[PDB]
Amino acid sequence: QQFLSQFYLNDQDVYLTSNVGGPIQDENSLSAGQRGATLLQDFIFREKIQRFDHERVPERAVHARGTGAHGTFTSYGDWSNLTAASFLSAEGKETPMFTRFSTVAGSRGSADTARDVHGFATRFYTDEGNFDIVGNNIPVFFIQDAILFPDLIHAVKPRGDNQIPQAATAHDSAWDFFSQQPSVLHTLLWAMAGHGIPRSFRHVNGFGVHTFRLVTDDGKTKLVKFHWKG
Amino acid sequence: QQFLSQFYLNDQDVYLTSNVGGPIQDENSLSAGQRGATLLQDFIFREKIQRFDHERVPERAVHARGTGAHGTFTSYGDWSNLTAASFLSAEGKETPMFTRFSTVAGSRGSADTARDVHGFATRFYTDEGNFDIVGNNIPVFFIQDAILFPDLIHAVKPRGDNQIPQAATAHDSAWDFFSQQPSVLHTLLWAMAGHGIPRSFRHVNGFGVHTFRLVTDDGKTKLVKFHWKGLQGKASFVWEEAQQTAGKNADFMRQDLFQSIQAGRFPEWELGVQIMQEQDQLKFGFDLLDPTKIVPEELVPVTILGKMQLNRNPMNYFAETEQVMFQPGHIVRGVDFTEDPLLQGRLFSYLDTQLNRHGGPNFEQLPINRPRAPIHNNNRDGAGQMFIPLDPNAYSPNTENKGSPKQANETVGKGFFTAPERTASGKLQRTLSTTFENNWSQPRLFWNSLVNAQKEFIVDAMRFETSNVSSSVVRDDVIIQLNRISDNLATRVASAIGVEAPKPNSSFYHDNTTAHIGAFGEKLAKLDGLKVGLLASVNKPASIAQGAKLQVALSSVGVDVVVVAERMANNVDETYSASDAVQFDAVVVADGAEGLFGADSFTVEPSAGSGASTLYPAGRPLNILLDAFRFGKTVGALGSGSDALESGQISSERQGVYTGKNAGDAFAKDIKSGLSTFKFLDRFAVDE
Amino acid sequence: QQFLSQFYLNDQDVYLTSNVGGPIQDENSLSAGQRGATLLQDFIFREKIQRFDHERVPERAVHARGTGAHGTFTSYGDWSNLTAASFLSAEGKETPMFTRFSTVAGSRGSADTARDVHGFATRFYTDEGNFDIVGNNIPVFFIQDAILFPDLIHAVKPRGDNQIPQAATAHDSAWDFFSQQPSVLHTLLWAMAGHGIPRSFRHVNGFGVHTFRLVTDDGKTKLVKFHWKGLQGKASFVWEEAQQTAGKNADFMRQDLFQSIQAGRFPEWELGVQIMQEQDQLKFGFDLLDPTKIVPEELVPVTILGKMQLNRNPMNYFAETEQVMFQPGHIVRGVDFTEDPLLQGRLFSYLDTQLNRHGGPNFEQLPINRPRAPIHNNNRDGAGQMFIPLDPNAYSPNTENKGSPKQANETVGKGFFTAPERTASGKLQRTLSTTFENNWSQPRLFWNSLVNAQKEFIVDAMRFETSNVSSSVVRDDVIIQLNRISDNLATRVASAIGVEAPKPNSSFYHDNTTAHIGAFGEKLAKLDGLKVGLLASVNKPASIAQGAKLQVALSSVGVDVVVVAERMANNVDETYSASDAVQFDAVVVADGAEGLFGADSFTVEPSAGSGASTLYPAGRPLNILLDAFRFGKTVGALGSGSDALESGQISSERQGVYTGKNAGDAFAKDIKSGLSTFKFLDRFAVDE
């Protein structure tokens, strides 16, 4: 935890300060007398409220609703005859990880247990760079070309006029798209089976979905599918 | 709609183009051969995906979950002896509006029917500028100084470590804050009464909360509270029903509004003011600058100014509803502020926060934010500058542009002006006014004024909520604060949560009341948009036919009949699988459907010989009927449909349970009576 | 102008308002009493100051310093057998244009007359989409792969530690990069010849630089170089005169363009193409995909397609010029890309960078970026969404919107299409093409083709620049690379900078030339907007009168006479204090003014008894004349005004020095002859 701990702020038994280290109080606005108007020169009020006013950032365009945890990866072998990937270079080799699980369609306050495909995004903080396998709990995806992504997502997400319905495929546009673009059918069956409504993030598998290459230092390749077997 | 239609993009029967008008196709990436890598020179791909990648904007910091509609205001009078406001200058004068309703705490995509305070934000596009009354459905707010807003909101919103729980006060921090800051108690009681879980946005009132000033052209002022008096009638849920609605339809209230407008059932509110004098700030026994205090209508009546009707849904939710940027600083000549420290700091926040949302300074140039009145000033540039100023000399005083734009003030040009007799006096200080210190008498006033069931609903809300508070210190501190309102309230809550019954503290106890202040106790004024679920069967076609018959008897009051059956046969509106009691204001068993309601239907083993339906979960028809009864809804049965009531152990002898021979006028009359009552309160136990 | 006029704000004779149309005053903050603190509730103060505080947007990452003008393109033919581009579909067809000229390295306040490559960016608002040719005044670029752009620009721009020097290549890093990456040498020679320091934006040509494809409706292609052939004529400064102009008028070239247009002296360029076959890519001894290579006009002539005229200045610089966002990816049906790795990567950069400048995705909605053709697509939302899409079903394929918008491709809807015979072949790789490796033959071509004076200008520029390079290693590396172009060039430069004279390295030496490639050596085509400064005296009224007389004889060719005198008397245009040689294309001493030009005037002690003027610095009149002479300008004197030439040791026997009896036609004819020559090159020493 050593790395992230450098950025921790411990606020046990300390005096309040501004963001530039001036001790302050923050419970009453500065007023012209006891029942007076608030003064512009109250920098304490304004720095506090400006931070508040700007707390939010755009939700992710997809997978807005999700949950993260830290962990570790341990390699079971020296995989150098299959791949040059350093995090796989030795039996026992440990690499820190961060993983986020998610739904897809819902905004960031929508219910965990919406029916949906689920994200399964795993970062390895390897000693030769961050490596992310940005996967899902289903091994196949709805569409065959990235250029179609806005079509799929606009159809699944809420209607453009009224933003109904939240986190759901149970509406005309979604099924219009599925029927017009039958590539969708494999993932649709997975998501409408139990995989759409898992009991917990611990009770699913993960998948990279795409075929990738593993490459050795001398340029030899294999084609692979990545799996996370729970 | 003249104004906004200039920005409409009509995509009926047209060819696809880029954002710079180049016709394009957008279904296959450009590749090096049939199974090749995608090329960087594919600008069509990149422009499409770049727009997609950047669709989102920050949700509002509070009131993120909400829904909007267009409408119009009509003045009832020439109010010039009260206010110089142009939109109020003549009887029959009309002004366009846009209104957004909301919760407070939950993020985008959180359930409409979370328990919360609700936003009720109304823009008037006046001919002398945009005027916003950024109100709520509760007349009092939690805190007395805007500087405390981050404290309140951080305590109510999810924990900082794990972001749990969504859209809820049922956690330690919220109740820690409420008990540590007892100013919160008045709003807390409102929200934990029916006002926190309204049936629809059409079935609430609105409030400006703060005392404002009205000011005439000659500088004369009155202090006022702004009101929006709803013409449909207050209607609210019980908690277990609001929870179930959150699970079945997160969009329930937004959908109600959208559908009602599409159906021509336009909801209305009357704009009112409680008119007071400058000398009334402390005379009532509480401070008019204190946003935790109501002015009871027994002390100051509501003077009705005019009417709002909401009558058009947005064409594009993002462009219109998501991007609308309300501000209390959107004020017009004839209105002014007061020294309420909550209002005072709001003024700063709502100008600043739009920089976060829009990403730059030109947010007033968005179509939904633009005025319907000329703009002439020396403001310039900024990202996203959509206008092209012709004046190259953007300063005053100038001769190079002949002294224009010209200064407007009280005497020339119809300028805004601060009420001229307002004064300041005293030492500059950061202090809590001693006039703000009674945090408990008005909560008690509210509590005293409720029907027994709604007192119980508050107790049961608090019991539910505080049972989820892990800290014993917090639980005890909550009871100590509640006891200062009422020893009865405190005792009743304490008994669920393992806290010793408190001894009375008579400091703030009193028996005064104010009329009709709760969400419960009055009949609805209008039945528009309410729904009757008719539970029918495809195996008895006559049962389905009762829908249209019943509908003919209910259409004149704006009530819809929804026919529910096992599958989508002719004249069926929904399937049992797709249905739930929470969809329906009344539930009626159709004549001939009774066979679907057997008491063994929840648990019978669905063997191949059992006859168990695969078209819906085991017990679904009877679950809908029983949930409707338990939630307090109007329940009925036609003909032999009454056998289903017997299966459910529901007697028609109970209030709000109706039987009839057939779907004609006699039965419809009784269902209308039930719907007007809305909820049958005798189905809820009350402490003794 | 109809299209942009919809966004104009006219602020003549109107009252001031807020950005939401409330009339206001904006000259005093709201205070607690006459001498009190400012109040937070002053929304007028805060909206005004917030707009101010947020006026700025990021400068362009390159080409930050620039100037724009509106105009029109007219096609000279129906070019359909060469290209499907609609703006070229018919003789006479007009398309609106916006053009921005710029330097490259300097930030947005740096001097116009910095030595640099200049941008020449032309937008056609075509009826089938915006088409941008984002070019420069030099036909070749420094680097061969877009991935190198940050290397080139980081080396040329100011040092990372101290941000010195501004808008200049005269520092170690720049010359380190040029010598390490000899692809740079062709553009370097162009920029260190006159092309780096042009007299005005009207006195340069433009170039697309890259090879592009033109494509007919049936898929046939040609390879082309785009040209903008200016109709005024190439005209350039010497370095010392560009420096002086930077000190006296940082806006000199921006001012020139604005004034010329306001005068009706509209500058023109003809659009042309060098038309080549696909099979010509490696036929000519260099690779058409290599952007460091020209196609000599002796090998492929320029075919002229039509004409651009610039004829209207912006109404608001920020809204129009600062916010225009060009992109090579703004391409239309009938044009396609090539595999030039510089072009390839540009396509990514110009879409991406507008996110930085605009702060969000909807930059194509700014008025100046909008097309003059329909827009219909399924792109949605994003901050700053100015449109309201009516289609709630924004996906393909759809039935809910009846299959609209419809795909457009080669055969329906006039879609863009990639030229269909283009192929890819080979291993995926990060490599430099071997066809790109001759960095030196074409710089030698360019060098061979210059008049001797312009060779000397290149030498003298490089001596100036490299004398400012501290690193001995860099200086030596520069000389080694120059020497591969020409031993003469390298030797001449080395002698200024303490580097040993190099021995010849003859691999790339040759004697070929291409015609009229430099900035110097041809007479101007038009004299429009050139200025004659007439140096007169208020003490001799007849000297001032020569102004109007001379003007009458020069108006017909678009040349202005500016009368300079001691103070602003009748018919005086500028004071001596306010004047400099760099303002004038020709300088003439008026008859009667000679008394101001004494040879002792720089150093005379200005005591009470001396008669030294306080109206201008000591020696200013003679300084203007001497600078004009030394800079190569036309100089003249009328009548006894010729005494001033004597004082300045300027003989009328020299070329470009003219004496006249009076300000009549004969003298006017000599001044026109001088202006046409523009610079007198015999005043510059040349190596032997």
Ligand code: HDD
């Ligand atoms: C071309 C568009 C596109 C396409 C075809 C996909 N994604 Fe995606 N995805 C995005 C564009 C995108 C994104 C818009 O770039 C997001 C939103 C937030 C982010 O960081 O990336 C994202 C987020 C995102 C996340 C959330 C990561 C997190 O927890 O922060 C996951 C797990 C995936 N994607 C998984 C996938 C899978 C397994 C795909 C198909 C095999 C897929 N996406 C296709």
Ligand code: HDD
């Ligand atoms: C000082 C901070 C502060 C305080 C004390 C309040 N608000 Fe607030 N409110 C904001 C700061 C804010 C904000 C952060 O500025 C928001 C978020 C989005 C926005 O535009 O303003 C906002 C949004 C917001 C909205 C949503 C408008 C919409 O639909 O877009 C409503 C209805 C209210 N508020 C109502 C109130 C009421 C009636 C208040 C007490 C009487 C109140 N707020 C106090």
Ligand code: HDD
């Ligand atoms: C891969 C990076 C890259 C490369 C190799 C080039 N450019 Fe560039 N250029 C940009 C990246 C860029 C940019 C960072 O995207 C700019 C900054 C502002 C903008 O809109 O685009 C830009 C601006 C810009 C402008 C200013 C347009 C305006 O007036 O607003 C011109 C005229 C050019 N470029 C011309 C060229 C020429 C003729 C190039 C070589 C043949 C060239 N650029 C290569």
Ligand SMILES: *[C@@H]1O[C@H](CO[C@@H]2O[C@H](CO)[C@@H](O)[C@H](O)[C@H]2NC(C)=O)[C@@H](O)[C@H](O)[C@H]1NC(C)=O
């Ligand atoms: C350009 O677009 C048309 C699209 O035409 C569709 O083609 C398929 C196959 O014939 C057919 O199923 C559709 O019904 C056709 N019509 C429409 C309106 O969709 C393609 O046919 C062309 O081949 C495309 N390609 C080129 C090179 O123009």
Ligand SMILES: *[C@@H]1O[C@H](CO)[C@@H](O)[C@H](O)[C@H]1NC(C)=O
């Ligand atoms: C890799 O391959 C070679 C040959 O098969 C062998 O010597 C060695 O055991 C392998 N190494 C690893 C890392 O397993």
Ligand SMILES: *[C@@H]1O[C@H](CO)[C@@H](O)[C@H](O)[C@H]1NC(C)=O
């Ligand atoms: C305002 O007051 C005056 C005096 O009471 C009265 O004459 C007039 O009718 C009033 N104006 C309006 C618009 O009611």
Ligand SMILES: *[C@@H]1O[C@H](CO)[C@@H](O)[C@H](O)[C@H]1NC(C)=O
């Ligand atoms: C209002 O402004 C006018 C016109 O500028 C000014 O002359 C007049 O004195 C002002 N009056 C007040 C009330 O300040």
Ligand SMILES: *[C@@H]1O[C@H](CO)[C@@H](O)[C@H](O)[C@H]1NC(C)=O
């Ligand atoms: C009701 O309020 C009045 C107003 O202050 C107060 O004086 C009175 O004592 C109260 N009566 C009761 C029953 O509490």
Ligand SMILES: *[C@@H]1O[C@H](CO)[C@@H](O)[C@H](O)[C@H]1NC(C)=O
């Ligand atoms: C194009 O080509 C054909 C054949 O050369 C000819 O009929 C016609 O004149 C040409 N058209 C144009 C537009 O010049």
Ligand SMILES: *[C@@H]1O[C@H](CO)[C@@H](O)[C@H](O)[C@H]1NC(C)=O
């Ligand atoms: C120079 O030009 C001649 C044309 O006569 C050509 O044959 C030759 O290849 C060119 N040489 C070089 C080195 O560019």
Ligand SMILES: [Ca+2]
């Ligand atoms: Ca205070």
Ligand SMILES: [Ca+2]
């Ligand atoms: Ca009954």
Ligand SMILES: [Ca+2]
């Ligand atoms: Ca390459």
Ligand SMILES: [Ca+2]
């Ligand atoms: Ca000098």
Ligand SMILES: [Ca+2]
């Ligand atoms: Ca001469």
Ligand SMILES: [O]
């Ligand atoms: O995704």
